[PDB]
Structure 1
Amino acid sequence: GPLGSMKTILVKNLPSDTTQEEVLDYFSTIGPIKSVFISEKQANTPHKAFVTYKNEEESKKAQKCLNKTIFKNHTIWVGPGK
């Protein structure tokens, strides 16, 4: 680990102030999450995160349910992280 080929999603277009806990809380509504890494980037530029679910099926559900939803004013893009 900590990532998994089908268990990890990549989330794009997060606001720069997003915290790991905020990501955890939002994404864990789909299923339990094992880890969250947020990419280190300049403030006021879009951020990315890798979110790894405990179960592959829940990763797929997050892609379906949470892609192009609004998170802190941003439309987030959710897909396989591979």
Structure 2
Amino acid sequence: GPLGSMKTILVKNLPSDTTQEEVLDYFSTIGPIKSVFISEKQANTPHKAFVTYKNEEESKKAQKCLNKTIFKNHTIWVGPG
């Protein structure tokens, strides 16, 4: 699609001690990633991170392939930014 922001997806529920490199490694299974942002923790809210893919085709596939997968010992949710 035409909007570059779409290449950035939201990852919910990563463990609090997860590193940016670990996110890179896990999400790079789908395709190349430009950047990883682990957001500051919001009060009373699950952890959130944003992964920006090089290609929208791969960000879409990541949502399908990685939603409700098990990252170490946490289930994670993956969807649109």
Q: Calculate the TM-score normalised by the size of structure 1.
A: 0.87
Q: CA deviation at 1:60?
A: 0.2
Find the aligned partners of 2:22 and 2:8 in 1 and give their Cα distance.
Answer: 17
Let me know the Cα RMSD of the aligned residues. 3.2
- Please, which moves more after superposition, 14-23 or 35-44? 35-44
Structure 2 residue runs of 5 or longer lacking an equivalent are none
CA drift at 1:24: 0.2
Structure ranking higher in helix proportion: 2
Residue matched to 2:65: 65
SS in 2 for 1:5: helix
Taking a change above 3 Å as real, the CA distance of residues 72 and 34 of structure 1, as seen in their structure-2 partners, is: same
In 2, distance between residues paired with 1:14 and 1:24?
13
Contact kept, 8 Å, 1:16 with 1:44, in 2: the verdict is no
Q: Tell me the SS of whatever aligns to 2:13.
A: strand
TM-score (norm 2): 0.88
**Counterparts of 2:28 and 2:80 in 1: how far apart (Å)?**
16
- Whether the 8 Å contact between 1:69 and 1:76 is mirrored in structure 2 is yes
Distance 1:2 1:10 in 2: 19
